[PDB]
Ligand binder design. Structure first.
Ligand code: MG
Lengths: 148, 76, 255, 76
């Protein structure tokens, strides 16, 4: 159906022109479930890390958003302990003109620049805001522990 | 009259209202019972998102009607 | 909490499912009496009065699902109905839709997704033109969610493009804290978003059509009811819609 | 004083108003010129919707200010 045709186009474009730091695709016969990887940005406390994510496309894609969560634990104000991601593109501001490539770019961008408006993990947001030295230390420690 | 407002969890809130009550009035009423600011409430009846300035009568909401209460996304 | 935002998303999906089971995307024609039968003198006298008066001029109503997309859907049903009766018009609209497609790329829309929606809609029209799609097949396509929503996205896209083409004029009409750019990305391009006057004006002018909206509210009205023509400039309207607070359906003159 | 009301048809309506006039009064004046009932009108100034019971002075609308008018046509 139309969802499957669209998902194939998303895969083709991503294979041909992937977002920097990012790879992704189906794990098996099911086109509706992908795994993705993001390399920790350089000049970030996630540097050297490899972070895995799970993408589930709904049956009415692209008219509803894909569901995207980290499976690698990560220390971040906008990403919670279940790997849930607080990013407008995934919920309030999804449109069918967007692609999984743009979602991955947006997640990368979020790793470098956390959103301070109504953060998903308030404690970590405080530490980012007020004690960057400690935030970077812990983020680096979790990178070593979970993402190496 | 009696109308019902169904929340996220399935919980049904009963309200007492006039047909000429505005949606804003109904949201203030819901605030009185659940303590949810009106700025965070969306009301839906028969597919339609209900406008603050309009009345219950504008949408032909009758006795024992059930509206949906859907809170606004917070993000972050 | 994001179990929060995800729980809301899940609830929104369940509400839409609830509406979908009850009503198709695009109903078969019904006589106007059916609209009147929604009302009665005991509990909805003002709406009954409006509907009965409209029954003098209108013979049929085509119910459009209330899923947030009803304005776009009513218009595209209206347009496709013209093109089914007017083969020359269809041929012209194909050529013009190919123009909209290049216009979207020129304005910096996302390349391949926007072109994919344009191409799907153009192929659909070409297949009506060639006779590969019968009238019955067309209504089946417009009721099959995947294809129906692909087609509807074309209309969302040209609505957005026209607003962006005319951003300086239209910026001061926005009242919810957004630029024209932000309004397009948040309120026009996504599915499931209601259309307001700004979006309505844009779609009608971008599609090059002429619409009469019968404004069926409870307000005591001059003989015949309140109505609005867009554009407002003496050609007869090509599409007639029924507006009741929060919702659009398509209606059809008796003669 | 004079104020201007721009519409989506591109027409500018010119109105004669006092700072003490309510938004409701302004809408009645628009009806006299254009025939749109006040309950079908939305007026905007400084990018926000104006409330019926407030005055032009409450919103700092003054000599030769420009308002924008749309119809209440929101629908899904
Ligand atoms: Mg008067």
């Amino acid at each position: 159906g139309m969802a499957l045709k669209r998902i194939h186009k998303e895969l083709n474009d991503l294979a041909r022109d992937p977002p920097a730091q990012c790879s992704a695709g189906p794990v098996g016969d099911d086109m509706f479930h992908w795994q993705a990887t993001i390399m920790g940005p350089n000049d970030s406390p996630y540097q050297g890390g490899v972070f895995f994510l799970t993408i589930h496309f709904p049956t009415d894609y692209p008219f509803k958003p894909p569901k995207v969560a980290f499976t690698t634990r990560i220390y971040h104000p906008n990403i919670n302990s279940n790997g849930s991601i607080s990013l407008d593109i995934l919920r309030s501001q999804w449109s069918p003109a967007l692609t999984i490539s743009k979602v991955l770019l947006s997640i990368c961008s979020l790793l470098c620049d956390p959103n301070p408006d109504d953060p998903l993990v308030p404690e970590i947001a405080r530490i980012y805001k007020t004690d960057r030295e400690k935030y970077n230390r812990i983020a680096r420690e979790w990178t070593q522990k979970y993402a190496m | 009259m009696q109308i019902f407002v169904k929340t996220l969890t399935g919980k049904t809130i009963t309200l007492e209202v006039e047909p000429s009550d505005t949606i804003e009035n109904v949201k203030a009423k819901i605030q009185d019972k659940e303590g949810i600011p009106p700025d965070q409430q969306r009301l839906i009846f028969a597919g339609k998102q209900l406008e603050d300035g309009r009345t219950l009568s504008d949408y032909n909401i009758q006795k024992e009607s059930t509206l949906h209460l859907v809170l606004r996304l917070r993000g972050g | 909490c994001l179990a929060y935002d995800e729980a809301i998303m899940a609830q929104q999906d369940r509400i839409q499912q609830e509406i979908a089971v009850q009503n198709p995307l695009v109903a078969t024609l019904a006589p106007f009496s059916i609209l009147c039968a929604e009302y009665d003198n005991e509990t909805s006298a003002a709406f009954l009065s409006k509907a009965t008066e409209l029954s003098e001029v209108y013979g049929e109503i085509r119910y459009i699902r209330g899923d947030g997309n009803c304005f776009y859907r009513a218009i595209l049903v209206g347009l496709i109905e013209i093109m089914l009766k007017d083969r020359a018009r269809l041929e012209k609209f194909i050529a013009s839709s190919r123009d909209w497609t290049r216009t979207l790329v020129e304005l910096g829309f996302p390349d391949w997704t926007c072109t994919d929606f344009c191409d799907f809609f153009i192929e659909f029209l070409e297949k009506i033109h060639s006779g590969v799609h019968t009238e019955e097949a067309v209504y089946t396509i417009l009721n099959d969610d995947g294809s129906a929503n692909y087609i509807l996205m074309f209309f969302r896209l040209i609505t957005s493009a026209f607003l962006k083409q005319n951003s300086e004029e239209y910026a001061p009409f926005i009242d919810e804290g957004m630029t024209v750019a932000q309004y397009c990305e948040q309120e026009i391009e996504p599915m499931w978003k209601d259309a307001d006057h700004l979006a309505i004006n844009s779609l009608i002018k971008a599609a090059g059509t002429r619409v009469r909206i019968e404004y069926m509210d409870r307000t005591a009205a001059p003989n015949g009811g309140w109505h609005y023509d867009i554009p407002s400039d003496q050609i007869a309207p090509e599409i007639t819609l029924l507006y009741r607070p929060g919702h659009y359906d398509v209606i059809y003159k008796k003669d």
